[PDB]
Amino acid sequence: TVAVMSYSGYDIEDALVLNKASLDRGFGRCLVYKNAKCTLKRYTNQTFDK
Amino acid sequence: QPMIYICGECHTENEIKSRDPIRCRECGYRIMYKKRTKRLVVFDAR
Amino acid sequence: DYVTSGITGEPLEAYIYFGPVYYQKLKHMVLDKMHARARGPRAVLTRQP
Amino acid sequence: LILTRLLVPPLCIRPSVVNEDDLTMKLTEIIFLNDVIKKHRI
Amino acid sequence: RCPDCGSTELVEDSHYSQSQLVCSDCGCVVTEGVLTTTFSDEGNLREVTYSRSTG
Amino acid sequence: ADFDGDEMNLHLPQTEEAKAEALVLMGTKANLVTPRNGEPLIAAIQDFLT
Amino acid sequence: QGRFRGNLSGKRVDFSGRTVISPDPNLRIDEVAVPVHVAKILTFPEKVNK
Amino acid sequence: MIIPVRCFTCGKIVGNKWEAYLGLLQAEYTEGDALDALGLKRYCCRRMLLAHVDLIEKLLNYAPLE
Amino acid sequence: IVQDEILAHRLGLIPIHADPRLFEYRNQGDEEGTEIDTLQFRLQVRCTRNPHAAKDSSDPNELYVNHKVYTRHMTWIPLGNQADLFPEGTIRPVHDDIL
Amino acid sequence: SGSMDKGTLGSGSKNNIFYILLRDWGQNEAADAMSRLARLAPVYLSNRGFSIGIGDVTPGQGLLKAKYELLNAGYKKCDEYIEALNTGKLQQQPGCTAE
Ligand SMILES: [Mg+2]
Ligand SMILES: [Zn+2]
Ligand SMILES: [Zn+2]
Ligand SMILES: [Zn+2]
Known part of the structure; x- marks a missing residue:
């Protein structure tokens, strides 16, 4: 719900201003998933990781 | 036990x-998933 | 629209353009970009950072 | 000006894992070929 | 062993990024900073068998 | 710079001799005008002119 | 990538940081604001005196 | 994924309107009549239901189920 | 399938019908709390297939029981003497209907 | 007299009032004056209000008439030239050929 106006001086060059009380109600909320993988193997000599 | x-x-x-x-x-x-932990975890409602 | 100031309480002079626009949030986030190095590992060939 | 001997540089300026630096593999080849000539001529 | 205390309680620990060896007994540093390879030379990595490398 | 996702570095000089040179020679106050022809470069930008 | 152009004239340094930039019109033109998390990494070795 | 409880802009509780909204649509009201009969005046609220995309009905088909 | 942080975020927004003039501010720390400055609710459901269900295999509402978690399922858990100070039914989430 | 604009506050040229302060009174006066302007302008403009919309771009009444009139005249003259060339009656400009 945007307004097009000059306001507060922290918005000069392509910066923009958000409403704190919307961020609290869910706006712009997100998730970030990352991955971590590992493997165990058997060597040519008869031994293996544990 | 196991x-x-x-x-x-x-x-x-x-x-x-x-x-x-x-x-x-x-x-x-041939795919297996571990079960959920038994401990409790504390979250903030924010 | 006609708008009232939220700080002073007195109406603004101009009429303000108001309405719905579709905004999308990009993947560039500051938390994944901050960085600093006091003193850390050095390369073996030339012993610069 | 015409050379008949060479220095092998220290291990500092060619680390262990490049497995070894190509300068090392070059040098081991030079000596190998040199040994070939001397036994071969003998 | 700690050069300042003689005690042998050295613990391997790291600050935010620096890897270091610290006498936990007295708060002293005895070694820090490491030299490692990078990713730039990782792509150039070859391999030679020990048989090839030993004749 | 334009605050559209930019980034900037920063260095912290480690010697009392280097502090004195950075402040005296490289300070902003001493560099309000560009040496190409002497015109001012640090002045007001949009939304302060309006 | 040779010695001259890569390691002698211009080279990597430490005690430095990097981050996004954003606006603030309540700083004097000669001050810069630094986050606490980057103030906790960087140091300056102040000698003790009277 | 699922219905947000509150309207972001003003804070009105819209989380309890989704089922009724689909009910009123299912009786061949228009969208405009549906929203008006649910009592969503300000347009900041109307988008909160109008432009929703309910993915939890779909995502559940892939869930592990007996 | 709802992530825990997101579920906890949703639960916060639900207005509670306690009168706020009867309680003090929790002091910093003291996470355990006490009967003068805290309230407790409990949520617990288990979705199960409806055994009586016929063979249409189409309507989720008929096929399952408690396959929806409304704010009806929150039960007030009195703490200390609050059960006595407050008559029954005056502590509850306001709307009774939120999903 | 007058009013302040880029020619007197902007980063382009001399006659900048911050430049006069720099040369005549030192560095500290020019650095201080800029700082006060940073704190003082936003407080005015953000409570006056200043906006742009599509009312600031829609063309009025007289504009449509002038535009239509001009287009008709221009195309006719363009026609006249291409008629002149393809008939070969066109006089060549004294720096080039007909094309
Ligand atoms: Mg940019
Ligand atoms: Zn199976
Ligand atoms: Zn010690
Ligand atoms: Zn609303």
Whole structure:
């Protein structure tokens, strides 16, 4: 719900201003998933990781 | 006593406790997922 | 629209353009970009950072 | 000006894992070929 | 052993990024900073068998 | 710079001799005008002119 | 990537940081604002005196 | 994924309107009549239901189920 | 399938019908709390297949029981003497209907 | 007299009032004056209000008439030239050929 106006001086060059009380109600909320993988193997000599 | 894994398809509880190959006791499926932890965790409603 | 100031309480002079626009949030986030190095590992060949 | 001997540089300027630096593999080849000539001529 | 205390309680620990060896007994540093390879030379990595490298 | 996702570095000189040179020679106050022809470069930008 | 152009004239340094930039019109033109998390990494070795 | 409880802009509780909204649509009201009969005046609220995309009905088909 | 942080975020927004003039501010720390400055609710459901269900296999509402978690399922858990100070039914989430 | 604009506050040229302060009174006066302007302008403009919309771009009444009139005249003259060339009656400009 945007307004097009000059306001507060922290918005000069392509910066923009958000409403704190919307961020609290869910706006712009997100998730970030990352991955971590590992493997165990058997060597040519008869031994293996544990 | 041994740890339990959930088969990826039929969700039948399995147990390994060994160097055995990962295979479902019931079906042919070959993917296993660990169970949820038993401890409680505390979150903030923010 | 006609708008009232939220800080002073007295109405603004101009009329303000108001309405719905579709905004999308990009993947560039500052938390994944901050960085600083006091003193750390050095390369073996030339012993610069 | 015409050379008949060479220096092998220290291990500092060619680390262990490049497995070894190509300067090392070059040098081991030079000596190998040199040894070939001397036994071969003998 | 700690050069300042003689005690042998050295613990391997790291600050935010620096890896270091610290006498936990007295709060002293005895070694820090490491030299490692990078990713730029990782792509150039070859391999030679020890048999090839030993004749 | 334009605050559209930019980034900037920063260095912290480690010697009392280097502090004195940075402040005296490289300070902003001493560099309000560009040496190409002497015109001012640090002045007001949009939304302060309006 | 040779010695001259890569390691002698211009080279990597430490005690430095990097981050996004954003606006603030309540700083004097000669001050810069630094986050606390980057103030906790960087140091200056102040000698003790009277 | 699921219905947000509150309207972001003003804070009105819209989380309890989704089922009724689909009910009123299912009786061949228009969208405009549906929203008006649910009592969503301000347009900041109307988008909160109008432009929703309910993915939890779909995402559940892929869930592990007996 | 709802992530825990997101579920906790949703639960916060639900307005509670306690009168706020009867309680003090929790002091910093003291996470355990006490009967003068805290309230407790409990949520617990288990979705199960409906055994009586016929063979249409189409309507989720008929096929399952408690396959929806409304704010009806929150039960007030009195703490200390609050059960006595407050008559029954005056502590509850306001709307009774939120999903 | 007058009013302040880029020619008197902007980063382009001399006659900048911050430049006069720099040369005549030192560095500290020019650095201080800029700082006060940073704190003082936003407080005015953000409570006056200043906006742009599509009312600031829609063309009025007289504009449409002038535009239509001009287009007709221009195309006719363009026609006249291409008629002149393809008939070969066109006089060549004294720096080039007909094309
Ligand atoms: Mg930019
Ligand atoms: Zn299985
Ligand atoms: Zn010690
Ligand atoms: Zn609303």
